[PDB]
Design a protein around this nucleic acid. Structure first.
Ligand SMILES: [Zn+2]
Ligand SMILES: [Zn+2]
Lengths: 292, 145, 49, 70, 39
RNA sequence: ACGAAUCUCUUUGCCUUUUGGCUUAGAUCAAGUGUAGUAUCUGUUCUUUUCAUGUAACAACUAAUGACCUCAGAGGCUC
RNA sequence: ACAAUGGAUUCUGGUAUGUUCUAGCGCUUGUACUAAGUCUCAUGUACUAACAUCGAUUGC
């Protein structure tokens, strides 16, 4: 029906805070992002003096089948993305719900003209069928390489020196880094410790972490920061031979440090992926030798 | 004109091109309507259990009957059902009424010189020589009887 | 090296392997075919394994 | 960059440049692919494989020659 | 083969779902724009 | 001459890879040479374009690679 | 004693049509020796024109 068409589905947070919004209707505007088929393009601005036009990117049929708005394509209730919506319902019904989309232009147009709901769009747009699953979300919250010749590399890693105040170095050697714990999280924890925040402007610290070798190093400019990095770390572990090592403390993780006393560079950790895995396998013993 | 050209550039041409009937294809569209009417009337005489295979074979007795008509050969199929033979002879006579009357109409046009196609002069010659011999063979049988 | 696909002859040409095509779902029925779908999915994944 | 007029070419010495030789080398590998595909066929005729088999020996000898120059 | 009878005609079900073009035909130009009503 | 089951076989039923338009049968049932056009190969003519012995003394080469150190890749040293 | 004067041009025309032509990486397993191009003429061959070919007189 070209003379009887639904009103558009737009979020409240796309429309924003103001009361009256002048919206422009173009009866066959752009074509839909999803079904590649033309529709009534609505576009508007939040305020009069704004500088960003907010367009409706998809048609109302693709917006109804997913239960999303046309502008930001987030869900109409819960205001979350579709990939996260179908994952949260998957933990409640214990089965995979998923809206699947055709890669084929004759099967993008076919899938839009049917009057079904897709994915979590049966659960959402029914308020009774959505609130009880939020209650079922609440009970979930009540639960709350032996052949490698690695010996050329381990001479350059320190592994035998202590974390004292007295050496004045720029570089350090961070080992026991998990395959999680992203490179930004270690620079933010050090910069929170020194108060040298927005460090990327002045380039106060430079950090290299491999994530295969489970090891890394962080370089400082201006060596007087090195005594600030030593003195602001209180907790240390002493190996039962000696040779105390400081612990950086990312949440639930422990990262050991030794002053390198030279610049490690890239490729100190490894020059091949198969080669770097054995250095993590080399270290895992020394961590167990350091602790136990 | 140019408005049709520019919109055909921006949008492409329509996929719903329905061809009107023409002098070029009136013999083609006549047989499509003639085959559908024969295929309807036989499928309604059938008691049950007739498919796309049995409807496909019966339409070849329609083509064979019209070749026997143009040859002035009596079309008699042994074992043909008498309702279904009655249907085909009704439509072969119907097609013959159009075939003969088109030979009378086009003959009067060729005598007047009033824009007959070069193919149709060879076609009207080929029709009348079948009509002349069919009238000749019928005259032979009236003396023999 | 992967198998190359036959190139599209026209614009809306269809790769039949990528998508179930003009899928028509079996009409919803009163018989709750829920465990049957689990067993068929398990057997299908077992086949492709 | 064109080079269609230029032979394979069986002579090697005439072109001093290696970067140009980079293009000449593909000019050969492509034929290696065409004929190579032309090696297995439903008919599997001896005469067709037999000529292709000789072409393979000729190409492998050329690969030995390029390796020897290096 | 390749010269076939029709098993079914082309339906208007297929042309109804297509998108229109809006091309201007000479026989769809306006003419006889007033209807005549019987007494 | 009536087996509760399997296989093999015979006969009816089923036809299960079991003729998919049209019109003037859609039309016809025929030696060499001559001319014009395109393509390939060979011959000739015309024009254009691609280079430069022996002995003695001196200088350069056989820039790159490896290792160590400083600075935030370069600099120095040795082989 | 007669003054009378129509035309007019474009388009749809044997190779048509059809296919392949991944250089630039998506993480895991696994020092083997010297023929240029263009233009014109001639000859040879192949294809092609859906080209054409019989109009008339005699010394045994
Ligand atoms: Zn859409
Ligand atoms: Zn939105």
């Amino acid at each position: 029906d070209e003379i009887n068409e639904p009103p558009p589905n737009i979020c409240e947070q796309c429309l924003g805070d103001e009361a009256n919004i002048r919206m422009t209707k173009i009866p066959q505007g752009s074509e839909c992002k999803i079904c590649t088929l033309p529709f009534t393009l609505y576009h508007f601005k939040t305020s009069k003096r704004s500088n960003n036009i907010i367009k409706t990117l998809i048609c109302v049929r693709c917006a109804t089948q997913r239960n999303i708005c046309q502008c930001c394509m987030l869900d109409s209730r819960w205001h979350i993305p579709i990939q996260l919506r179908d994952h949260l319902i998957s933990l409640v019904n214990e089965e995979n719900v998923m809206t699947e989309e055709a890669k084929n232009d004759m099967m993008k147009r076919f899938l839009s003209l049917k009057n079904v709901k897709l994915g979590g769009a049966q659960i959402t747009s029914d308020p009774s069928e959505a609130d009880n699953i939020v209650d079922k979300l609440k009970n979930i919250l009540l639960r709350a390489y032996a052949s490698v010749d690695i010996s050329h590399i381990l001479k350059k890693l320190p592994l035998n020196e202590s974390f004292l105040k007295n050496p004045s170095t720029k570089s350090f050697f961070l080992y026991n880094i998990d395959a999680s714990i992203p490179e930004w999280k270690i620079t933010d924890t050090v910069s929170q410790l020194l108060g040298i925040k927005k460090w990327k402007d002045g380039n106060s610290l430079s950090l290299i972490v491999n994530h295969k070798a489970k090891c890394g190093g962080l370089r400082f400019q201006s060596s007087e920061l090195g005594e600030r990095f030593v003195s602001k770390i209180s907790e240390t572990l002493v190996t039962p031979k000696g040779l105390k090592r400081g612990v950086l403390l990312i949440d639930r993780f422990r990262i050991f440090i030794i002053p390198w006393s030279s610049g490690f560079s890239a490729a100190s950790f490894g020059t091949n992926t198969a080669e770097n895995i054995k250095l993590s396998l080399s270290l895992n013993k020394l961590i167990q030798l350091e602790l136990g | 004109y140019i408005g049709n050209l520019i919109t055909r550039q921006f949008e492409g041409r329509s996929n719903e091109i329905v061809k009107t009937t023409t002098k070029q294809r009136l013999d083609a569209y006549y047989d499509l309507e003639l085959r559908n009417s024969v295929m309807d009337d036989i499928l309604e005489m059938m008691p049950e259990s007739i498919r796309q295979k049995k409807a496909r074979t019966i339409l070849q007795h329609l083509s064979e009957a019209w070749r026997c008509w143009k040859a002035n050969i009596p079309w008699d199929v042994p074992g043909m059902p008498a309702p279904i033979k009655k249907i085909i002879e009704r439509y072969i006579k119907s097609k013959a009424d159009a075939w003969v009357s088109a030979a009378h109409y086009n003959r009067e046009r060729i005598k007047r010189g009033a824009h007959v196609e070069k193919t149709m002069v060879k076609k009207n010659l080929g029709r009348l020589t079948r009509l002349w011999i069919k009238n000749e063979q019928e005259r032979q049988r009236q003396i023999q009887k | 090296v992967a198998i190359k696909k036959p190139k599209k002859k026209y614009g809306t040409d269809i790769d039949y392997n990528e998508d179930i095509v003009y899928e028509q779902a079996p009409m919803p029925g009163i018989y709750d075919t829920s465990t049957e779908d689990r067993q068929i999915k398990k057997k299908f994944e077992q086949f492709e394994r | 960059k064109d080079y269609s007029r230029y032979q394979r070419p069986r002579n090697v010495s005439k072109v001093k440049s290696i970067k140009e030789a980079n293009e000449w080398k593909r000019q050969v590998s492509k034929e290696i692919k065409q004929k190579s595909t032309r090696i297995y066929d439903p008919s599997l005729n001896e005469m067709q494989i037999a000529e292709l088999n000789d072409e393979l020996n000729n190409l492998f000898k050329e690969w030995k020659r390029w390796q020897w120059h290096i | 083969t390749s010269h076939r009878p029709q098993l079914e005609a082309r339906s208007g079900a297929k042309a109804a779902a297509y998108t229109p073009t809006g091309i201007e035909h000479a026989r769809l130009l306006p003419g006889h724009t007033t209807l005549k009503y019987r007494k």
